[PDB]
Design a protein around this ligand. Structure first.
Ligand code: HEM
Ligand SMILES: O=C(c1cccnc1-c1ccncc1)N1CCC(O)(Cc2ccccc2)CC1
Length: 436
């Protein structure tokens, strides 16, 4: 009854219900998420106010679902789910060093190598008949890239290795959203314990390598270890291991899958993308850093994919004191939900919101002002945004260079929600090599 005055109700996901409600009830709406009343805020004025300030911090009660799942510590107090500013700021600044310009440029080989491996696997299946799950294939590529890039490990999922790990990740992701029977609880808990134990194993290996005096290239793991340099235990270290292990591939994978799915019904845009890749990189097997900037139309297409299909759909901030938010009195101690998914699909912010038009992001176009934030905004924006943007460009360019994709009829364009948003179907495609 402290929220009853707030406007709201008395392959389709919860985020679409939020969209319906935002359109019907306005820019500040009372909802239910994780059994706590929150308020969904969809004006750009409020996006700017709350996301662009260090006065407003993440709401720990909303992130509890990431911290622990059915009594098993998952993301814990790692970089995403830490809600105390000062503890967050300490780890952010140390881990930042692994995402410097020069750190990222040195990852171009890993990106090219895994992309080339994926494409060679796909080319062998390109008979215009064999159904290929592009969701699965892109997920394996994202994982292999992340494992190598962040941790110096070879998962070899593209070779069919690590099935138990891919199961662990899948069951864990389902559990996050499920917590919003007996056998599900057992499977979820064991999967989370498995992921942390992988963490312990890889950490010990890294420590052993350093002890024996072997070469260890400075990576995300190096800075994560640095962030914990005199902690009383390894729990903080394991929290970040799991956080980056998951966050570092899941959404890149989803983003790739959504893009391939959408592009399957956009032959004109595909022909333009094929033409750009042919002109910028020709037959080069390897994309250089400077080539990435020249794939301008591809950049625009990936931005438009994220407008309609943001895998990371939202973020929460704690409103501490009663505040007037677009003409609505919102009580203190209230979680505010900001959703780039909802805003992206509102005709108030985007003309013909359901039309896929890369020209929205053209060099002369008016830039969206606080209506588009697939990597969020402000101090809690995605640390891996540029890592992600580079990796998906490399993967997309290499697919476009070499293969034609047709979505198998019956495959749907609808969404599912498992912490993140992702294609409902496995994006089954048949493939042909480019050039007949
Ligand atoms: C297209 C791919 C990606 C998308 C769409 C994305 C999106 C986001 C969003 C929306 C947030 C804010 C989360 C929140 O407020 O709760 C975030 C934060 C974060 N992301 Fe990503 N991300 C992507 C890729 C990555 C990658 C590749 C990494 C690591 C290699 C990563 C690691 C993180 C971390 C550690 C945070 C917390 C940052 C902080 O609070 O300081 N993400 N990301
Ligand atoms: O922490 C994650 C995450 C969860 C699972 C896999 N990956 C990532 C992730 C990938 C890339 N960058 C950051 C993080 N996300 C993505 C989910 C939401 O945006 C909202 C959300 C908040 C609370 C509970 C569920 C959902 C939040 C932040």
């Amino acid at each position: 009854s402290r929220y009853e005055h707030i406007p709201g109700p008395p392959g389709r996901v919860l985020q679409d219900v939020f969209l319906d409600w935002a359109k019907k009830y306005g820019p500040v709406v009372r909802v239910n998420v994780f059994h706590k009343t929150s308020v969904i805020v969809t004006s750009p004025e409020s996006v700017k106010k709350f996301l662009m300030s260090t006065k407003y911090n993440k709401d720990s009660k909303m992130y509890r679902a990431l911290q622990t799942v059915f009594g098993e510590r998952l993301f814990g107090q790692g970089l995403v789910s830490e809600c105390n500013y000062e503890r967050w700021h300490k780890q952010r600044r140390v881990i930042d060093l692994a995402f410097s310009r020069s750190s990222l440029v040195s990852l171009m080989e890993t990106f090219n190598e895994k992309a080339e491996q994926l494409v060679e696997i796909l080319e062998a299946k390109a008979d215009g008949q064999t159904p290929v799950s592009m969701q699965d294939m892109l997920t394996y590529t994202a994982m292999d890239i992340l494992a190598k890039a962040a941790f110096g490990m070879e998962t070899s999922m593209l070779l069919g290795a690590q099935k138990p790990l891919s199961q662990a990740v899948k069951l864990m992701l389902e559990g996050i959203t499920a917590s919003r029977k007996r056998k599900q609880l057992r499977e979820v808990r064991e999967s989370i314990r498995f992921l942390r134990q992988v963490g312990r194993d890889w950490v010990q290996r890294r420590r052993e390598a350093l002890k024996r005096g072997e070469e260890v290239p400075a990576d995300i793991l190096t800075q994560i270890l640095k962030a914990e340099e005199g902690a009383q235990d390894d729990e903080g270290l394991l929290d970040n291991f799991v956080t980056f292990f998951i966050a570092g591939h899941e959404t890149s994978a989803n983003h790739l899958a959504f893009t391939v799915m959408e592009l399957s019904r956009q032959p004109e845009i595909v022909a333009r993308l094929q033409a750009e890749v042919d002109e910028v990189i020709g037959s080069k097997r390897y994309l250089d850093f400077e080539d990435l900037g020249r794939l301008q139309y591809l950049s625009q297409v990936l931005k438009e994919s994220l407008r309609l299909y943001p895998p990371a759909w939202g973020t929460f901030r704690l409103l501490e004191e009663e505040t007037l938010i677009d003409g609505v009195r919102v009580p203190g101690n209230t979680p505010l939900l900001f959703s780039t998914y909802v805003m992206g699909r509102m005709d108030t912010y985007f003309e013909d919101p359901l039309t896929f038009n890369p020209d929205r992001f053209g060099p002369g176009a008016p830039k969206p002002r606080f209506t588009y934030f697939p990597f969020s905004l402000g101090h809690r924006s995605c640390i891996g945004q540029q890592f992600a943007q580079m990796e998906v460009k490399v993967v997309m360019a290499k697919l476009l260079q070499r293969l034609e994709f047709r979505l198998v009829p019956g495959q749907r364009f609808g969404l599912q929600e498992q912490a993140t948003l992702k294609p409902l179907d496995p994006v089954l495609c048949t493939l042909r090599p480019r050039g007949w």
